Curated annotation (Swiss-Prot):
The modification Phosphothreonine is found at residues 176, 181. A motif (TXY) lies at residues 176-178. Its main location: cytoplasm. The TXY motif contains the threonine and tyrosine residues whose phosphorylation activates the MAP kinases. Residues 250-268 bind DNA. SUPFAM superfamilies: Protein kinase-like (PK-like). This is Mitogen-activated protein kinase 1. Gene3D superfamilies: Phosphorylase Kinase, domain 1, Transferase(Phosphotransferase) domain 1. Changing residue 65 to N: In NS13; results in increased MAPK signaling; reduced interaction with DUSP6; no effect on interaction with MAP2K1. It comes from the Eukaryota. The keyword Transcription regulation applies.
Length: 349
């Protein structure tokens, strides 16, 4: 019958032996297993999304993106297991390269050399350039979404919150709430942004970089507005012309109402960090999203010159303009669309 893992059913069938449980989630469960056709241990997350209309949007988005992206710094999909019919399908299993750890697990325990920090940051930017070249925004870059194997190869995962970029419809009101992880939110998310620009991802990488320099998140806000307060605590009060790009008065006046606080110098917060690294951190974490450095510009920064090579930093061939309108879609057209996009892995194809 179906083999079990910590109680639940985990029937990944005759290609994947020797189940070895790793973790859980709201609808996830991930296990180690032996891939008999290719003789390598692989990862498998078992998604059970079809009850919540919001979980199918996150599942169809990840699956669609991941299959079209092919990049050494973005996790791929090796296989997909589901039932042969739509109505027998209660689960979808995604087979990925097994990855021993992630940056979150590693920052909790290991203190990174400057060579490691430089290398991990290069790998993030190089895969991000491919994402942005496909006109995709990740929107949830944090350490736990950066996998690593035992030779410190880095791969970006979990495109569940990703959108096709849309800079012309990015503006919104003050305190317009947001799904992505709080500690890595750009300040403009809390002021006037829906997170539909590429600059939303650079800020998160900036945050990852700061956390790599010190094994500590730089802006650990505890609720939605403390986040903005943490950022201004270190960047200092936004300049006049910075404020002169915030047209929304509810956001502009909140900023005016705060007492003047001085910039905290980076060399102070990170006094054994490479000075080249602090200067790029500066450009990645500029308050003004338009002043903020772009991904390809970050790759050509002197801090990464030992690795920089634009001919070896590939861009996507197939960009999206298919924002796919997934959230005007009922229970069933999501399930039927997840069913259709996985067909290329079913036997008889």
């Amino acid at each position: 019958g179906p083999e079990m893992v910590r109680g639940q059913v985990f029937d990944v069938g005759p290609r994947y032996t020797n189940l070895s449980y790793i973790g859980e989630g709201a609808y996830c469960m991930v296990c180690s297993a032996y891939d008999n056709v290719n003789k390598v241990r692989v990862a498998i997350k078992k998604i059970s999304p079809f009850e919540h209309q919001t979980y199918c949007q996150r599942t169809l988005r990840e699956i669609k993106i991941l299959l079209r992206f092919r990049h050494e710094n973005i996790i791929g999909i090796n296989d997909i297991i589901r039932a042969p019919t739509i109505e027998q399908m209660k689960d979808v299993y995604i087979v990925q390269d097994l990855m021993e750890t992630d940056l979150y697990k590693l920052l909790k325990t290991q203190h990174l050399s400057n060579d490691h920090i430089c290398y991990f940051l290069y790998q993030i930017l190089r895969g991000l350039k491919y994402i942005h070249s496909a006109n995709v925004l990740h929107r949830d870059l944090k350490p736990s979404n950066l996998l690593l194997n035992t030779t410190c190869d880095l791969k970006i995962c979990d495109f569940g919150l990703a959108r096709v970029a849309d800079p012309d419809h990015d503006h919104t009101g003050f305190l317009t709430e947001y799904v992505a992880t709080r500690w890595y939110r750009a300040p403009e998310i809390m002021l006037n942004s829906k997170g539909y620009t590429k600059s939303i991802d650079i800020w998160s990488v900036g945050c990852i970089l700061a956390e790599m320099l010190s094994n500590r998140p730089i802006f650990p806000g505890k609720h939605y507005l403390d986040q903005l307060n943490h950022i201004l605590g270190i960047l200092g009060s936004p300049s006049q012309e910075d404020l002169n790009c915030i047209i929304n008065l509810k956001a502009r006046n909140y900023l005016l109402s705060l007492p003047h606080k001085n910039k905290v110098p980076w060399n102070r917060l990170f006094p054994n960090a490479d000075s080249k690294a602090l200067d790029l951190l500066d450009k990645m974490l500029t308050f003004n999203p338009h002043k903020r450095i772009e991904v390809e510009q970050a790759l050509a920064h002197p801090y990464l010159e030992q690795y920089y090579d634009p001919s070896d930093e590939p861009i996507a061939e197939a960009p999206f303009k298919f924002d796919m309108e997934l959230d005007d879609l009922p229970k069933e057209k999501l399930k039927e669309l997840i069913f259709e996009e996985t067909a290329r892995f079913q036997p008889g194809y």
